[PDB]
Design a protein around this ligand. Structure first.
Ligand SMILES: [Mg+2]
Ligand SMILES: [Zn+2]
Ligand SMILES: [Zn+2]
Lengths: 43, 95, 98, 465, 77, 49, 86, 58, 196, 98, 383
């Protein structure tokens, strides 16, 4: 979508990944993979 | 009576008439010889101009915002009363 | 030719003794403080009705005079007194403007 | 009643020590009485100033005021690591006169000096036993220093030729303290004066506590006043009067300066004057004239200082740091110099001349505001006019400062130091991972330094170094 | 275009590994977005290839400790 | 326009000459034959009593 | 070095030391509850001053106060400090 | 006229005149004079002020 | 300018060998930085005028007599030309080691007197609108505790002192709030019930 | 030298200001279309009116007074006063060819 | 002179305290102890020195619960009332410019360093200053003559200025030829003069408009640079600039791009980043305070710089910055005495939670700074 909307959505996704990782619902490797996926998909 | 009693004058002037200061002899004598500039601004208006020699005192000014804008007459200075321009014009043309 | 070289001053700067030996801002502050002193302001003060008024009980005329003091009538309506002055450090109660 | 805790405040309240906690003492009179050492924190003066009082009403408020806001706990300011409470004007000159090495005292004079303090005990033997028993001012001062205090440092009077930069000084310019014994040097603004960081008083307070500083300021600073009362300290009119040969030398120097200015003017008139880059001609000539006149004033001041007594009371007040400077002495004894308005000579007046007393187009030093007399000798009428014109712009001398401080207060009011050592906001945001870089309070700093290692070395091995 | 990381006003920037960042946020007791922020379009952020959700470890010069370490959180914009 | 010179239609040539003199003064200032007028000079100040 | 060495030095320094705010709070609370009818834990027979704040100060100086400071660290860890004879 | 929003703004309004700052009880103001015989912790008080201001002691 | 710091009796004042006592003592530290030489000159001229009974004119640029003639005449009348005196301490009787300058200077009393400048308030009337202390010395009074004093108190870290200054002693009040809507109710005082 | 008004003594303070019926010229503000300025404050029996004369970067003189919103060219306002030809205006301004 | 035995004792005794103080303090202590000469030194002296250093460092630590923001604000703003004054901006106006986050300063300025081969040559530095300074046509023209008879403008050039700027008449003619004027005709009247004849124009208004259009034409220089000054600091020559252009100067040959300085903080933020921007902010505040003789500790300035760059951008401390980002309605309505904030909060249904200090003081509840951070527990039974 728009650059601003993409930025907002990627910020939200990073927040969700960090929240899930901090609750021990994810491992470090899965969090790394999801962060890479979001960064590549929103570049 | 209202103009003399309030100080608000015609033409936008304010503070023209004040209550005479009678704290002592010098207070009244100095109040009767005070000159206030209508500017009371520019830092050049507060300067001691060399043209003030013998006309305004170089020492009697307030301290602060009104410094340089409220003055006092020198000892021997007077203020001109003026005459009709027509007499001088006739003299100049006849000259 | 100048009539009177001291006529560059006003009436309050004309009461200062030896004004050319002082720094100028002190001469300026003197003029402000000379309008706040208590003395005799009128000879008929007892029959007047002023909102606020003062009266020094024993006024003196200055021993060190200027030529303008007698012209303006200040020697007949004085606002001060002559004090025996010492310049010394004593007890520490006169430090920094006391 | 005596001993009650109140809040004492002076406006404007710029920092937090503008309001401190005080202990009540009821005295006759209708005035608020304040110690003279407490004035710098309040920026207070005795010209007619007023201050506010507040009485806390609850037990918790009184306890907080007594525990956190008491005066002696706030001797060192938080702005920089230095004392904001210290000696003033009679304190400095009294300390200098007492601690100078020529002061000898008898048993009765020592008992009179020590009677204003809390001292009771043995005086020891007099420093001089024969031909007559005499005490020394340094010996009496040493009674109040801790018996392991060491200090080496120069005195304020060591600005001039008497400076030696080592312990071998015949002028008492270098302070030597070993095991709490004043063996050399004098006490002046650089040892006991307020707002002097890394001074002897600052080190005493830092290494012995603020209670020791309170005890020292309440006992030793009274001795200085008492000794001034015994010695006598005045200012006469012969302290600022120079002989005739000094006046003749000053006159010759003034003639030389006027000749130099005339040569500059002639070179300008003949078109042989080089300009300074970025400025036109007739603007460079003014710079040359101003430089020449400034050098003339400096040389005349040097001559006047040379032919004056170096031990009169004005010189004592100047060199020790009590009141006055060398410019004041130069103006009172040699000459005022060039008067200026916004960096320029006095020019505004009639056409091509400031006053009607001067010729058309005259730009000589006297015509544009150079005063060659002193306050002791008196000013000419036009010299008085020029002097009054030069000082006009100081009479004019806050909303912007208040607005900036208010904006800073509203921006920063929510920051706190945590038990972690972190600086965080009350909403949880992290500002600094550790306060500053070493988590050192500026109020406890050794003048912005967490530790002064040279000071520690002097503390440990200063008595044999 | 131009390499600016060698300027004397620029401190050292380093991307922080996920395990180290996790340990840091656990031992500080915060969420990652409670640190000071750095934009992904920052001139020094792009020089090291920093993506949003990362934590940058910055070493600055200090007159009190010599070297001081600071952390920033990469945001979008 | 210039009430101090009159308020009648007969007083228009005087106003024209006055404006011409003012324009002459400003042109003299332009060509560097003059300097700006000093407002602190007492020749330009009047005292009302 | 948990986060930094300076933070470890800070927390080690304040481990067994009272800040001035804690001293002020303890003294104020003790004085307030001592003026409300509590019995002093010291002799209070030969003290220089007999007001509540002086007695609270003397009670704090010689540890007799059964008061505990609860320090809550930002990560949730809790530290307890006792002023009763330390 | 002075209306609802005029009672809230300004330096004499509700906020800066009555909420951020206010006039308080048990306070005094007087000229100051020196006293070298006091401690640095002390302040000298007139007898008149000492008898008017009070401290409530239980 | 200055303010009176203490008043000392004649027994405690320092006296000269003739028994003369000063009316006012001025600190030597006030002169050197302000550079008012005319005051010392006036002191010498006043002592000369009192000793000789002759007029003293201090008009600028035209002073008669000159200072040197004044000092010579002072010496001939039985005093030291430099206007100094030998002085003893009135409390102990011991001679000071230096000579002190005595003179005669004209002093003025200004209408700023402490008898019209001090005001205190413990309790009194309050405003009808804000229920806060009144204003002015004409009324019972009350000093304003502004924002800067509040900033000082916050900087010192005194929460209970802040409360005591800003709530207990100005406008402390009690209100009743409904727990459902958060609006201010009242106590009926007749049916003994809370009404929202 | 004072008045007694309702029992009070009233003094009239002297007011200092610029001369009214004279032309004062000055430079324009830096970086502006106006290069030189001339100002006149003509005072009648009961009112005063200010007349301003400007010179622009175009080397043209414009007149501007109170009761007209815009700037009138010098020659236009001179023709309304009875100066019809260009020679009359030119010789009324000055005799110098430069 | 310290023998090897005592030096080994010092080194052994200094290695067991490495974790007890900061590294810089340890280095300073080691460097200071090794310089003791003229005194016979002892092991007990070393022990006392080290113990006193550790104790002195421990005694200086800040205390938790301190209201450090108010103290920093009072320590920075209090000397602002004691300030008593190319002519760059300085003092309180400059400090206000810094803390209000102005996009462009009132008096921009740069300090330009040169590479090693241009470093110690005056001619090369003068050449760089010549080619970076912005020059117009009127900066080299001594007299301008406008002719009404044939619609011609004659230009006279100052030889000294023309040489100083390094400009030639041929390139001036080429630059004028590229202009929009139209059909013109240039003829030489001397070796330093020529005339533009305007074979087309009709009136005098357009002739003048063409004249000021010609006189404002740029000849050379980087845009924004009003004046360049060559200064000799040590053995190096530095260029001081009256304007500011970081991007333009970075492209000039011979410029040291790793040492270039500016007082424009927004350009530095845009080009170099936010950490460089906050370092520059701290440097500027420190310089402004120090050149007036006012002593302020650097920790306050560092805290202010940190607070103004927290969000990744430079923000002012005022309404549109740090203060306006606060999450309290009442605090904002008290700082900004306006009532529009309360109307906005009512319209959007905001919720105010009383976390700051100002709102709690407004309603009358204790704050969480100082003694409000402490929480107590007691055992009443212990009598
Ligand atoms: Mg004062
Ligand atoms: Zn020496
Ligand atoms: Zn309800």
């Amino acid at each position: 979508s728009t650059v601003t909307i993409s930025d907002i959505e990627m910020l939200l996704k990073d927040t969700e990944i960090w929240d899930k990782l901090l609750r021990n619902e994810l491992s470090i490797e899965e969090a790394k993979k999801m962060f890479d996926d979001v960064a590549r998909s929103y570049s | 009576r209202h103009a003399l009693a309030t100080g608000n004058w015609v033409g936008g002037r304010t503070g023209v008439s004040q209550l005479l200061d009678r704290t002592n002899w010098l207070s009244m004598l100095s109040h009767l010889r005070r000159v206030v500039s209508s500017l009371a601004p520019n830092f050049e208006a507060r300067d001691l101009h060399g043209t003030q020699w013998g006309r305004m005192c170089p020492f009697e000014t307030p301290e602060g915002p009104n410094s340089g804008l409220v003055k006092n007459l020198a000892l021997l200075a007077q203020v001109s009363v003026g005459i009709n321009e027509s007499v001088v014009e006739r003299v100049a043309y006849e000259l | 030719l100048e009539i009177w070289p001291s006529a560059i001053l006003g009436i309050i700067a004309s009461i200062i003794p030896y004004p050319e030996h002082n720094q100028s801002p002190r001469n300026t502050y003197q003029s402000a403080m000379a309008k706040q002193s208590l003395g005799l302001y009128a000879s008929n003060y007892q029959i007047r009705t002023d909102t606020r008024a003062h009266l020094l009980h024993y006024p003196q005329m200055p021993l060190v005079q200027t030529r303008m003091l007698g012209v303006i009538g200040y020697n007949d309506r004085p606002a001060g007194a002559n004090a025996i002055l010492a310049i010394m450090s004593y007890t520490g109660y006169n430090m920094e403007d006391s | 009643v005596d001993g009650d805790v109140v809040l004492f405040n002076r406006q404007p309240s710029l920092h937090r020590i503008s309001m401190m906690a005080h202990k009540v003492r009821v005295l006759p009179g209708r005035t608020f009485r304040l110690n003279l050492l407490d004035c710098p924190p309040y920026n207070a003066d005795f010209d007619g100033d007023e201050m506010n009082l507040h009485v806390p009403q609850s037990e918790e408020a009184i306890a907080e005021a007594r525990e956190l806001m008491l005066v002696h706990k706030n001797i060192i300011t938080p702005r920089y690591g230095g004392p904001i409470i210290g000696g003033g004007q009679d304190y400095i000159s009294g300390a200098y006169l007492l601690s100078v090495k020529t002061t000898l005292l008898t048993v009765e004079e020592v008992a009179t000096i020590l009677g204003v303090t809390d001292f009771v005990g043995e005086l020891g033997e007099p420093a001089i036993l024969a031909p007559k028993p005499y005490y020394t001012g340094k010996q009496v001062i040493s009674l109040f220093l801790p018996k392991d205090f060491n200090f080496h440092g120069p005195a304020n009077i060591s600005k001039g030729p008497r400076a030696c930069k080592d312990e071998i000084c015949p002028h008492d310019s270098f302070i030597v303290i070993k095991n709490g014994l004043l063996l050399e040097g004098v006490f002046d603004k650089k040892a006991i004066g307020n707002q002097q960081p890394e001074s002897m008083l600052h080190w005493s307070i830092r290494e012995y506590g603020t209670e020791y500083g309170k005890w020292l300021m309440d006992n030793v600073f009274k001795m200085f006043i008492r000794f001034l009362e015994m010695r006598g300290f005045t200012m006469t009119l012969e302290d600022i009067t120079i002989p005739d040969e000094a006046q003749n030398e000053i006159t010759t120097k003034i003639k030389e300066g006027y000749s130099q200015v005339d040569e500059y003017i002639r070179k300008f008139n003949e078109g042989q004057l080089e300009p300074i880059p970025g400025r036109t001609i007739e603007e460079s000539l003014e710079s040359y004239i101003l430089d020449t006149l400034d050098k003339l004033r400096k040389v005349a001041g040097e001559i006047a200082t040379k032919y004056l007594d170096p031990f009169n009371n004005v010189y004592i007040m100047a060199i020790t740091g009590a009141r006055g400077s060398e410019l004041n002495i130069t103006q009172m004894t040699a000459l005022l110099g060039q008067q200026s308005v916004r960096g320029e000579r006095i020019r505004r007046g009639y056409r091509e001349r400031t006053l009607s007393l001067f010729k058309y187009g005259d730009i000589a030093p006297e015509a544009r505001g150079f005063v060659k007399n002193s306050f002791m000798r008196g000013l000419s009428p036009y010299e008085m006019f020029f002097h009054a014109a030069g000082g006009r712009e100081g009479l004019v001398d806050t909303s912007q400062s208040g607005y900036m401080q208010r904006r800073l207060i509203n921006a920063l009011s929510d920051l706190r130091i945590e038990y972690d050592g972190t600086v965080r906001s009350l909403y949880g945001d992290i500002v600094q991972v550790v306060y500053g870089d070493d988590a050192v309070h500026p109020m406890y700093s050794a003048h912005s330094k967490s530790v002064n290692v040279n000071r520690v070395i002097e503390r440990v091995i200063g008595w044999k170094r | 275009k131009i390499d600016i990381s060698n300027h004397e006003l620029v401190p050292k920037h380093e991307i922080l590994q996920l395990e180290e960042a996790y340990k840091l946020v656990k031992e500080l007791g915060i969420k990652p977005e409670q640190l000071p922020w750095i934009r992904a379009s920052d001139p020094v952020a792009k020089s090291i290839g920093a993506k949003p959700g990362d934590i940058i470890k910055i070493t600055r010069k200090s007159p009190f400790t010599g070297e001081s370490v600071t952390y920033r959180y990469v945001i979008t914009g | 326009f210039l009430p101090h010179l009159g308020t009648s239609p007969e007083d228009r040539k005087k106003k024209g000459y006055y404006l011409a003199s003012a324009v002459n003064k400003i042109l003299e200032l332009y060509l560097g034959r003059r300097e700006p007028d000093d407002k602190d000079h007492y020749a330009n100040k009047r005292v009302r009593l | 070095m948990t986060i930094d060495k300076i933070n470890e030095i800070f927390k080690e320094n304040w481990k067994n030391k009272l800040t001035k705010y804690e001293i002020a709070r303890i003294i104020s609370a003790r004085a307030l509850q001592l003026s409300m009818g509590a019995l002093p834990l010291i002799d209070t027979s030969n003290l220089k001053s007999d007001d509540v704040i002086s007695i609270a100060e003397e009670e704090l100086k010689r540890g007799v106060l059964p008061i505990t400071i609860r320090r809550i660290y930002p990560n949730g860890q809790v530290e307890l400090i006792s002023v009763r004879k330390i | 006229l002075r209306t609802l929003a005029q009672r809230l703004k300004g330096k004499e309004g509700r906020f800066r005149g009555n909420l951020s700052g206010k006039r308080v009880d048990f306070s005094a103001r007087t000229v100051i004079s020196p006293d070298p015989n006091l401690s640095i912790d002390e302040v000298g008080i007139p007898y008149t002020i000492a008898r008017m201001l009070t401290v409530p002691e239980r | 300018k200055g303010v009176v710091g203490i008043l000392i009796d004649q027994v405690d004042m320092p006296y000269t060998a003739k028994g003369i006592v000063p009316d006012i003592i001025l600190n030597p530290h006030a002169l050197p930085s302000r550079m008012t030489i005319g005051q010392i000159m006036e002191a010498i001229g006043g002592k000369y005028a009192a000793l000789s009974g002759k007029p003293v004119d201090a008009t600028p640029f035209l002073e008669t007599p000159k200072l040197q003639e004044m000092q010579k005449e002072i010496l001939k009348l039985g005093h030291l030309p430099d206007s100094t005196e030998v002085v003893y301490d009135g409390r102990t009787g011991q001679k000071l080691k230096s000579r002190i300058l005595f003179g005669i200077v004209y002093y003025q009393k200004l209408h700023h007197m402490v008898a019209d400048k001090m005001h205190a308030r413990a309790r009194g009337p309050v405003q009808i609108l804000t229920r806060q202390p009144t204003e002015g010395r004409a009324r019972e009074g009350g000093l304003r505790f502004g924002e800067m004093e509040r900033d000082c108190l916050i900087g010192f870290g005194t929460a209970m002192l802040i409360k005591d200054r800003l709530l207990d002693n100005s406008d402390k009040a009690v209100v009743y709030i409904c727990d459902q809507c958060g609006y201010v109710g009242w106590y009926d005082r007749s049916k003994n019930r809370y009404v929202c | 030298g004072y008045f007694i008004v309702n029992g009070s003594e009233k003094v009239i303070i002297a007011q200092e200001d610029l001369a009214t019926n004279r032309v004062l010229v000055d430079y324009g503000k830096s970086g502006s279309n106006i290069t030189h300025v001339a100002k006149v404050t003509s005072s009648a029996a009961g009112y005063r009116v200010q007349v301003m004369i400007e010179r622009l970067k175009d080397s043209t003189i414009q007149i501007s007074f109170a009761t007209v919103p815009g700037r009138i060219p010098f020659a236009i306002i001179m023709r309304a006063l009875g100066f019809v030809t260009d020679r009359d205006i030119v010789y009324a301004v000055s005799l110098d060819p430069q | 002179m310290i023998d090897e035995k005592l030096k080994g004792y010092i080194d052994k005794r200094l290695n067991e305290i490495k974790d007890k103080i900061p590294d810089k303090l340890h280095e300073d202590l080691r460097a200071a102890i090794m310089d003791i000469n003229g005194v016979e030194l002892t092991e007990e002296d070393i022990d006392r020195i080290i113990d006193l250093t550790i104790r002195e460092y421990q005694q200086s630590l800040i205390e938790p619960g301190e209201a450090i923001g108010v103290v920093t604000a009072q320590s920075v703003g209090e000397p602002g009332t004691q300030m008593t004054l190319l002519n760059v901006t300085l003092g309180l106006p400059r400090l206000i410019e810094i803390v209000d986050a102005r996009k462009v300063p009132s008096t921009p300025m740069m300090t330009i360093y040169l590479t090693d081969e241009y470093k110690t040559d005056k001619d090369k530095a003068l050449d760089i200053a010549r080619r970076i300074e912005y020059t117009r046509v009127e900066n080299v023209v001594s007299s301008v003559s406008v002719d009404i008879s044939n619609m011609s403008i004659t230009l006279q050039f100052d030889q000294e200025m023309l040489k100083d700027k390094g400009v030639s008449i041929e390139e001036i003619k080429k630059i004028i030829t590229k202009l929009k004027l139209g059909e013109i005709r240039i003829e030489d009247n001397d070796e330093y003069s020529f005339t533009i004849y305007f074979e087309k124009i009709d009136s005098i208004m357009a002739l003048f408009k063409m004249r000021e259009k010609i006189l404002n034409t740029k000849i050379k220089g980087v845009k924004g640079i009003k004046r360049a000054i060559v200064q000799k600091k040590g053995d190096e020559y530095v260029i001081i600039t009256d304007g500011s252009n970081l991007e333009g100067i970075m492209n000039v040959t011979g410029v040291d791009i790793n040492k270039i300085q500016t007082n424009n903080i927004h350009e530095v933020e845009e080009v170099l980043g936010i950490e460089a921007a906050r370092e520059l902010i701290s440097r500027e505040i420190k310089k402004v305070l120090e050149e007036q003789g006012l002593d302020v500790d650097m920790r306050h300035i560092v805290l202010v710089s940190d607070i103004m760059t927290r969000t990744g951008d430079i923000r002012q401390i005022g309404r549109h910055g740090v203060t306006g980002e606060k999450s309290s309605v009442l605090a904002r309505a008290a700082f900004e005495v306006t009532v529009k904030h309360l109307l906005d909060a009512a319209a959007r249904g905001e919720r105010e939670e009383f976390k700051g200090v100002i709102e709690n003081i407004i309603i009358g509840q204790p704050i969480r700074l100082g003694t409000g951070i402490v929480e107590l527990t007691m055992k009443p039974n212990m009598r």
